[PDB]
Design a protein around this ligand. Structure first.
Ligand SMILES: NC(=[NH2+])NCCC[C@@H](N)C(=O)O
Length: 158
């Protein structure tokens, strides 16, 4: 039925597309904040406050990771899954860098830790661009959903 088409298009939008977009957006926001806290721990002088912040940053990393893993269970085939797979590769790359940064910040200090982040921009930028492309895919899905919904309501003008 034309009316069930409206309901299903709406349900896909409200219960699949929007939660995807909200989730990826929130993960990107958290990742971006987490990234700045990695630089934020470098001017720090007290080694116990450095330790603390790295622990908190690692907690956020795992949250990001858990959210990514959960989000990857919802991805649709095609460009999104492909993009998400790439993102997970760059995420693992970046968390490998991050674990090296943390190990180096905890051991040698910010002077020797800062280059890990500074020289690994291509690793982080690739991660960022995967989020951007993923957000682009979901933005496209949202607008395509809205077009579908608006289209399916044409039956009510009959
Ligand atoms: N759920 C998810 N992670 N991806 C699919 C989101 C867009 C899909 N509902 C659509 O194209 O309508």
């Amino acid at each position: 039925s034309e009316l069930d088409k409206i309901q299903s298009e709406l349900l896909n939008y409200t219960d699949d597309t929007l939660p995807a977009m909200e989730n990826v957006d929130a993960i990107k926001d958290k990742m971006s904040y987490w990234r700045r806290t990695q630089f934020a721990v470098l001017p720090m002088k007290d080694e116990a406050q450095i330790r603390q912040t790295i622990e908190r940053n690692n907690r956020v990393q795992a949250e990001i990771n858990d959210s990514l893993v959960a989000y990857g269970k919802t991805v649709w085939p095609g460009e999104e899954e492909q993009t998400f797979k790439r993102l997970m590769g760059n995420w693992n790359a970046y968390t490998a860098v991050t674990d090296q940064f943390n190990q180096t910040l905890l051991t040698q200090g910010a002077d020797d830790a800062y280059p890990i982040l500074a020289n690994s921009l291509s690793t982080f930028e690739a991660l960022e661009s995967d989020f951007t492309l993923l957000i682009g895919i979901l933005h496209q899905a949202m607008d395509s959903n809205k077009v579908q919904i608006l289209s399916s309501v044409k039956t009510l003008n009959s």
